Amino acid sequence: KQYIFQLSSLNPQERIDYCHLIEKLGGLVIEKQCFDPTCTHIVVGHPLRNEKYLASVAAGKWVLHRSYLEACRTAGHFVQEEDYEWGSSSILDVLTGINVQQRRLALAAMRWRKKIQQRQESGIVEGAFSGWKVILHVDQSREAGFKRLLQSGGAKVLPGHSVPLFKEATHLFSDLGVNIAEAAAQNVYCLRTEYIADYLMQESPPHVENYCLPEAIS
């Protein structure tokens, strides 16, 4: 089996210590600030709505608590992942300070891992955003992160926000030169970026009408 890690929401010394442990154990770490779809596992210090966490869920990666690696260190090899998944009872029942956002994030990680891995062995490639064709109009500080997140779950991110693209688009997300009302007039879902995360975080997410951008309202 392949053991290609990323790391997220960890102290620098934790990251250094774990990079060394993972290599010692025979795995690899992708040391990038951004999400990389080549990875198979991620160890997360704190479940957050950041690029690595959400994109790992969208693709159904193993999303693991740090005690995983400590059990690996003891065993002298990579142990079974199940009891160390953030969404598992073994982790959730023992930890404190987990707020509702984090619990939802942890549970979603496990749920999407299960869903996607049953489709892999069935021979289909299909993340959380499969079938989505997306126009992004988001803060430049954040756009590339959303694009990778969306792509990780199998969405097509369309190039640009020109009106001609609206007929190909299913979703237009914004958190803010884009003619939104024009897209809405064509029944493109014109939605706040929060929908992306809640879509992953929730078994049954609220109706899209709850996330409508201002120009798309009634």
Binding site: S8, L48, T193
Partner: peptide, 10 residues
């Protein structure tokens, strides 16, 4: 932490 990757949200 300053060393945790910022969220994609306010």
């Amino acid at each position: 932490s300053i060393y945790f990757t910022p969220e994609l949200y306010d």
